[PDB]
Symmetry: C2
């Protein structure tokens, strides 16, 4: 019951959309906002809101690359990578205990 509550209280990383964004970035480190939006089939508006939540919590960082091809890049931070791994590991442990 103690590990279940841990997962239940992860309101930031637990959200299915944010979790997917973090899993997407885990192996890639960074990607243009426009690519994430298209590949994960999200509207620019929803993606934007989730990105803000993640960045306010230091899980990702965003910056404009105006090297003359305007693009906003989303990058997972070192903290973001570790937090995601911790959360994914806790989730894996709970699932393994269920025997599916």
């Amino acid at each position: 019951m103690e590990e279940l509550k841990e997962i239940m209280k992860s309101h930031i990383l637990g959200n299915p959309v944010r979790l997917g964004i973090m899993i997407f970035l885990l192996p890639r480190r960074k990607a243009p906002f426009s690519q994430i939006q298209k590949v994960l089939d999200l509207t620019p508006g929803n993606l934007d809101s989730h990105i803000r939540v993640l960045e306010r919590n230091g899980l990702v960082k965003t910056y404009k690359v105006i090297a003359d091809r305007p693009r906003t890049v989303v990058e997972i931070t070192d903290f973001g990578m570790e937090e995601a791994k911790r959360f994914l590991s806790s989730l894996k442990a709970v699932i393994d205990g269920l025997d599916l």
Copy 2:
């Protein structure tokens, strides 16, 4: 990328609180509202709202047991059990592919 989107679109079962409630019920089948509230450290108000979302989607069912000890019982439905397992299996597959 196809399985990631599947998990990201599970707005009902994906929510960390609802997921925890379903994982709690998976091995127990049913429990009094009051027990779930206390063991998962949730306020009666938040639990109530999540339960309504789950019940409107046929994942759980609720009923009052007035056998002269008034209590609301929360029970996971057969559909709820299968949907949860499907979602948990998809989640497990994504995690295994990450190599943690």
